[PDB]
From a paper:
We generated an X-ray crystal structure of PBP2 at 2.65 Å resolution containing two macromolecules in the asymmetric unit. As the two protein chains were structurally similar (root mean square deviation of 1.8 Å for 511 matching Cα atoms), structure description will be focused on chain A based on model completeness. The pedestal domain of PBP2 (aa 53 to 243) is further organized into three subdomains known as anchor (aa 53 to 68 and 216 to 243), head (aa 78 to 165), and linker (aa 166 to 215). The catalytic site of PBP2 encompasses strictly conserved residues in DD-TPases arranged in the following motifs: S(326)-x(T327)-x(I328)-K(329) containing the catalytic serine, S(383)-x(C384)-N/D(D385), and K(537)-T/S(T538)-G(539)-T(540). During the course of model building and refinement, we detected an extra region of electron density lying above the active site cleft and that was consistent with a metal coordination site, later assigned to zinc. Moreover, inductively coupled plasma mass spectrometry (ICP-MS) analysis of PBP2 in solution confirmed the binding of zinc to the protein at an equimolar ratio, therefore excluding the binding of zinc as a mere crystallization artifact. As a result, the zinc atom is shielded from solvent and sits atop the catalytic Ser326, from which is only 10.2 Å away (distance Zn–Ser326 Oγ).
Within the elongasome, the SEDS (shape, elongation, division, and sporulation) protein RodA catalyzes PG transglycosylation in concert with the PG cross-linking activity of PBP2, a class B penicillin-binding protein (bPBP). Here, we show that PBP2, which is the major enzyme responsible for bacterial cell shape and a target for the diazabicyclooctane (DBO) class of β-lactamase inhibitors, holds a noteworthy zinc-binding site in the transpeptidase domain.
Residue numbers in the entry: 62 to 222, 239 to 543, 557 to 615
The structure:
């Protein structure tokens, strides 16, 4: 007799419950209790309102299952199913109505894109799974924390002639911060990631719009799923983790540090800005966002005024191979290594990539596009937050992660700290100077209008090129606070938000919640 284990709960950093189990009524039948099992299901079909899906799944498991095995026929029965079965109960001996545990998401939409959903164990999963371990377990993780920590959450089964519960997860995410971040993207497409730069802990992760993951737990009706999948605003899509955007001017502060590293520029190195750059012999004029230019432009001026010319000149000297090596140290161009499924690589374009994908050689014009966060350069909001955290913490590499603690019997190693330091040929002062530049983006630069009187925000705005709404430019903001001892770095992508200054507006409340509110009046359920 197998006794399947209780799935472990998922909490927040403060112990706010985000996923539990509640009991429901489930129609089981045992192979020991039923001869001629194939006929019995055809009878129970109209009694329990079984669909062709619910049916096939039962026969799938009962073949690959033991005797004392309790194979579920329908899960979380409706009051009607209970009644209709109850009427003819003793015409099916051995077919029991049993108290089994379903999965619930108390704040479904809020953490859908982090926690995800469990669902019924399909046929593909059955052929990859230890049948003895998942004996009498009906639900398995499909996406989010529920998939990425399936084993840790599952538990170990027992018997009678004692089962081990799944481990509890405490996420690094904060209920209150997740609420405030979600509020800002209410009725808007985009994404907000907050990271603790000291650790790589994700404090908030919002893709907008969201969805109810409770719809998926005990099957989703093809009506409800097709509304979500065919919806134009794409709510099932994780813009924070899978979504990739041109980072635009957000990547300039890090590329400037690359300038200092390779010894190409220093803080004083200035350029004549005519509002364009030309490559030797090339006719194509690569235009500054402001076609009059910014005059005599040093590093500080290039950051506060987002000068494209400074970075066209810097990148041309640096070259794509040295831009790859350097920018990849901030997380760009490969998976950040987050403990969630389906993370996108992004793309930092390189010559080897060009020779595989376009079977063409690399042209020095393509370097210039990449220098201002355009060309084929695409980044996840995850990547942009990581890069910001690394800028904030003076080059300590952090791995974005949602798992803070796990309590239970299963042993587990939890990352809590940075995994390395970038060898940087400048000094610690070069990171402090770049912080002051980024404070001045907020004070007297491109991100004016999101200033606070209680703490300093370092930041950098950007825009990205894509139904008179959906074709508008995306607004991007990266930043961190309190600037001198960073606690939180944020990346905002407001899809069709037009200006990075707009995206910055969405970050101030997230920063404010974390640094002012949460100590006195924390948002609780
Ligand atoms: Zn300029």
């Amino acid at each position: 007799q197998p006794l399947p284990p209780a799935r472990g709960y998922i909490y927040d950093r403060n112990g706010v419950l985000l996923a539990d189990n509640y009991p429901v009524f489930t129609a089981t039948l045992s192979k020991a209790d039923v001869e001629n099992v194939d006929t019995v299901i055809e009878q129970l079909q109209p009694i329990l309102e079984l669909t062709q899906e619910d049916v096939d799944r039962f026969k799938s498991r009962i073949k690959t299952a033991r005797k004392t095995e309790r194979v579920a026929i329908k899960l979380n029965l409706t009051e009607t199913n209970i009644a209709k079965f109850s009427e003819v109960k003793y015409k099916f001996p051995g077919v029991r109505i049993e108290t089994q545990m379903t999965r619930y998401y108390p704040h479904g939409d809020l953490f859908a894109h982090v926690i995800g959903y469990v669902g019924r164990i399909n046929d593909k999963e059955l052929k990859s799974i230890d049948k003895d371990l998942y004996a009498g377990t009906n639900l398995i993780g499909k996406i989010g924390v529920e998939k990425s920590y399936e084993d840790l959450l599952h538990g170990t089964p027992g018997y009678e002639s004692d089962p081990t519960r799944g481990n509890d997860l405490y996420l690094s995410l904060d209920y209150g911060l997740q609420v405030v971040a979600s509020q800002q993207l209410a009725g808007r497409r985009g994404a907000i990631v907050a990271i603790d730069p000291r650790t790589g802990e994700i404090l908030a992760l919002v893709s907008s719009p969201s969805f109810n993951p409770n719809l998926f737990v005990t099957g989703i009706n093809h009506k409800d799923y097709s509304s979500l999948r065919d919806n134009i605003d794409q709510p099932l899509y994780n813009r924070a983790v899978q979504g990739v955007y041109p980072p635009g001017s957000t990547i300039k502060p890090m590329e400037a540090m690359g300038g200092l590293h390779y010894g190409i520029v220093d803080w004083a190195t200035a350029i004549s800005d005519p509002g364009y750059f030309h490559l030797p012999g090339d006719s194509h004029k690569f235009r500054d966002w402001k076609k009059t230019g910014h005059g005599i432009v040093n590093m500080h001026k290039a950051i506060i005024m987002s000068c494209d010319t400074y970075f066209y000149i810097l990148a041309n000297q640096m070259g794509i191979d040295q831009m790859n090596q350097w920018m990849r140290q901030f997380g760009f161009g490969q998976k950040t290594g987050v403990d969630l499924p389906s993370e996108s690589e992004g793309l930092y374009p390189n010559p080897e990539w060009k020779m595989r994908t376009r079977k063409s050689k690399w042209m020095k014009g393509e370097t210039i596009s990449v220098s201002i966060g355009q060309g084929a350069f695409t980044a996840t909001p995850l990547q942009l937050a990581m890069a910001t955290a690394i800028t904030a913490n003076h080059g300590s590499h952090v791995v974005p992660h949602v798992l803070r603690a796990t309590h239970g019997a299963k042993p587990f190693t939890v990352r809590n700290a940075p995994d390395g330091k970038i060898n940087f040929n400048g000094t610690d002062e070069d990171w402090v100077k770049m912080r002051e530049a980024m404070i001045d983006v907020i004070q007297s630069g491109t991100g004016r209008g999101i200033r606070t009187p209680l703490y300093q925000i370092a930041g950098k705005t950007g825009t990205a090129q894509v139904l008179s709404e959906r074709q508008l430019d995306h607004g991007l903001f990266v930043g961190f606070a309190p600037a001198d001892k960073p606690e939180i770095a944020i990346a905002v992508i407001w899809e069709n938000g037009r200006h990075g200054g707009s995206a910055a507006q969405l970050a101030k409340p997230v920063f404010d919640y974390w640094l002012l509110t949460r100590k006195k009046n924390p948002i609780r359920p």
